[PDB]
């Protein structure tokens, strides 16, 4: 009753879209364990996301914190809702994301991209069906394992199959929580990953004790953040956090892009020409090269408009407030969705048209209607890491390979925590040059 006055009805994100179009910029939803309000006006996006006065709603994030009694993200960097505790760990971990820290990862990005491309080249008979979803997540996993934790997962070599099963099952579990054997598998998956965390953490401390060389990475900084804890629960919270966040959304984004570009030959031909002109025959992309891939840069932005893996963020409204002419009571979770806003014609002309020119220099920039890495103090720490990562992978693909989506492969979405292609993005492949 306390929310009955708010406009509302008497893939779920598409229902959110229908509701936003039908009911306006402030709509109540009852799908989560708590009534919440989805807010889709730019003014509100700006007001709520671009302020330190508004914090994440812990009731909504507890779904990431613990899954079916089993601690997952805990109080790591994504799911920590206390400002003081968040701010402390953010600033320590920030160091691993400095310009120079990121620049030094170019070798890892290039190596794993080059491995992927050679693996695909060997299958490029225009006949063999290849799951680009699988191949791209293997690549994202291998990049992250090495870049963040100094570990070689070798998923591109077909290793660590149990590990990717664990990730899959726990992600499905986050959404499902919104029988007997599903719960068992999910719980086991979560514990498996935290145990992997302990393993790799042990390996690092031992490396350190034996006075071996340890490059400064994300793991260095999540250890620094926990210098005087009474246990390793915070450490493992952050391990899991970065282990998942550090590859899942990147994988989703890559898969979405390849899927869409597979029906955009004109754009692909343009992307192919850009890559040819800037890197040439080179096998390695420098940092400075990434900047000159302007058209690919725009393509990836447009891919994030239509297909954002991270679809929602929540803030706690503490005091009753008027939001776009709607009275919203105090203690209410507010939902912000780049997915919904990206598909609204009031925000984007022909919203379902894939046009990279929307992000061309001299194009009017989306003013608070596009936020695939969110906005304000709780924006993605991994944003530049991701942008560089996916540019390197995409550029090597485009340099070397032609992709054709196997007929019957759908363009639909599925929700497994984040949004990703429903289908495995099966493609046949041919080398460039006939
Ligand atoms: C295309 C790839 C990526 C997308 C679209 C993306 C999107 C987002 C979004 C929307 C948030 C806000 C979360 C929230 O409001 O609850 C976020 C935060 C975060 N992302 Fe990402 N992300 C990406 C890649 C990465 C990478 C590569 C890393 C790690 C290397 C990462 C780690 C994080 C972390 C730790 C946070 C929490 C930051 C904080 O609150 O201080 N993400 N990301
Ligand atoms: C914006 C967040 C909370 N989402 C999300 C989830 C997992 C990893 C990442 C991530 C961020 N950076 C890298 O990975 C982002 S989500 O939108 O998928 C989501 C999922 C479940 C419930 C909700 Cl409410 C939202």
UniProtKB/Swiss-Prot annotation:
Protein origin, superkingdom: Eukaryota
EC numbers on record: 1.14.14.25
PROSITE patterns xrefs: CYTOCHROME_P450
Tissues in which the UniProt entry reports expression: Expressed in brain. The mRNA was broadly distributed with higher levels in gray matter zones and lower levels in regions rich in white matter. Not detected in fetal sample but its expression increases linearly with age.
Gene Ontology molecular function: cholesterol 24-hydroxylase activity; heme binding; iron ion binding; steroid hydroxylase activity; testosterone 16-beta-hydroxylase activity; testosterone 6-beta-hydroxylase activity
Membrane topology field: Single-pass membrane protein
Family: Belongs to the cytochrome P450 family.
Keyword Endoplasmic reticulum in record: yes
Cofactor(s) in the UniProt record: heme
Function: P450 monooxygenase that plays a major role in cholesterol homeostasis in the brain. By promoting constant cholesterol elimination in neurons, may activate the mevalonate pathway and coordinate the synthesis of new cholesterol and nonsterol isoprenoids involved in synaptic activity and learning.
Protein name: Cholesterol 24-hydroxylase
Residue numbers binding heme: 380
Gene3D superfamilies linked: Cytochrome P450
Annotated Gene Ontology cellular component terms: dendrite; endoplasmic reticulum; endoplasmic reticulum membrane; postsynapse; presynapse
Source organism (scientific name): Homo sapiens (Human)
InterPro entries: CYP46A1, Cyt_P450, Cyt_P450_CS, Cyt_P450_E_grp-I, Cyt_P450_sf
Keyword line: Cell projection, Cholesterol metabolism, Endoplasmic reticulum, Heme, Iron, Lipid metabolism, Membrane, Metal-binding, Microsome, Monooxygenase, Oxidoreductase, Steroid metabolism, Sterol metabolism, Synapse, Transmembrane, Transmembrane helix
Record bears the keyword Acyltransferase: no
Pathway membership: Steroid metabolism; cholesterol degradation; Lipid metabolism; C21-steroid hormone metabolism
A matching Pfam family: p450
GO biological process: bile acid biosynthetic process; cholesterol catabolic process; nervous system development; progesterone metabolic process; protein localization to membrane raft; regulation of long-term synaptic potentiation; sterol metabolic process; xenobiotic metabolic process
Enzyme kind, highest EC tier: oxidoreductase
Catalytic activity: cholesterol + reduced [NADPH--hemoprotein reductase] + O2 = (24S)-hydroxycholesterol + oxidized [NADPH--hemoprotein reductase] + H2O + H(+); cholestanol + reduced [NADPH--hemoprotein reductase] + O2 = (24S)-hydroxycholestanol + oxidized [NADPH--hemoprotein reductase] + H2O + H(+); 7-dehydrocholesterol + reduced [NADPH--hemoprotein reductase] + O2 = cholesta-5,7-dien-3beta,24S-diol + oxidized [NADPH--hemoprotein reductase] + H2O + H(+); 7-dehydrocholesterol + reduced [NADPH--hemoprotein reductase] + O2 = cholesta-5,7-dien-3beta,25-diol + oxidized [NADPH--hemoprotein reductase] + H2O + H(+)
């Amino acid at each position: 009753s306390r929310y009955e006055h708010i406009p509302g009805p008497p893939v779920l994100q598409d229902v959110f879209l229908d509701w936003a179009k039908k009911y306006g910029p402030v709509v109540r939803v009852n799908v989560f364990h708590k009534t919440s309000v989805i807010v889709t006006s730019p003014e509100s996006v700006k007001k709520f996301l671009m302020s330190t006065k508004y914090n994440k709603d812990s009731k909504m994030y507890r779904a990431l914190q613990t899954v079916f009694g089993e601690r997952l993200f805990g109080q790591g960097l994504v799911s920590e809702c206390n400002y003081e505790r968040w701010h402390k760990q953010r600033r320590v971990i920030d160091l691993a994301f400095s310009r120079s820290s990121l620049v030094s990862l170019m070798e890892t990005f290039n190596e794993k991209a080059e491995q992927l491309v050679e693996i695909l080249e060997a299958k490029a008979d225009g006949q063999t069906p290849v799951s680009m979803q699988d191949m791209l997540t293997y690549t994202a996993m291998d990049i992250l394992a090495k870049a963040a934790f100094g570990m070689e997962t070798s998923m591109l070599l077909g290793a660590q199959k149990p590990l990717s099963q664990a990730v899959k099952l726990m992600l499905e579990g986050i959404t499902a929580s919104r029988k007997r054997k599903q719960l068992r598998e999910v719980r086991e998956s979560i514990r498996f990953l935290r145990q992997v965390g302990r393993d790799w953490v042990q390996r690092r401390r031992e490396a350190l004790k034996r006075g071996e060389e340890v490059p400064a990475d994300i793991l260095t900084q999540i250890l620094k953040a926990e210098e005087g804890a009474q246990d390793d629960e915070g450490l493992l919270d952050n391990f899991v956090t970065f282990f998942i966040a550090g590859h899942e959304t990147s994988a989703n984004h890559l898969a979405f892009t390849v899927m869409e570009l597979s029906r955009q030959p004109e754009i692909v031909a343009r992307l192919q020409a850009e890559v040819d002109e800037v890197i040439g025959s080179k096998r390695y992309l420098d940092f400075e090269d990434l900047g000159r891939l302007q058209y690919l840069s725009q393509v990836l932005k447009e891919s994030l408009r239509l297909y954002p893996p991270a679809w929602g963020t929540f803030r706690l409204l503490e005091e009753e407030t008027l939001i776009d002419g709607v009275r919203v009571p105090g203690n209410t979770p507010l939902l912000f969705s780049t997915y919904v806003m990206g598909r609204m014609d009031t925000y984007f002309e022909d919203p379902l048209t894939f046009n990279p020119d929307r992000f061309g220099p001299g194009a009017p920039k989306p003013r608070f209607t596009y936020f695939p890495f969110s906005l304000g103090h709780r924006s993605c720490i991994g944003q530049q890491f991701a942008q560089m990562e996916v540019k390197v992978v995409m550029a090597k693909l485009l340099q070397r390979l032609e992709f054709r989506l196997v007929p019957g492969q759908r363009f639909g979405l599925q929700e497994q925590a984040t949004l990703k292609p429903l289908d495995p993005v099966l493609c046949t492949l041919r080398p460039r040059g006939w």
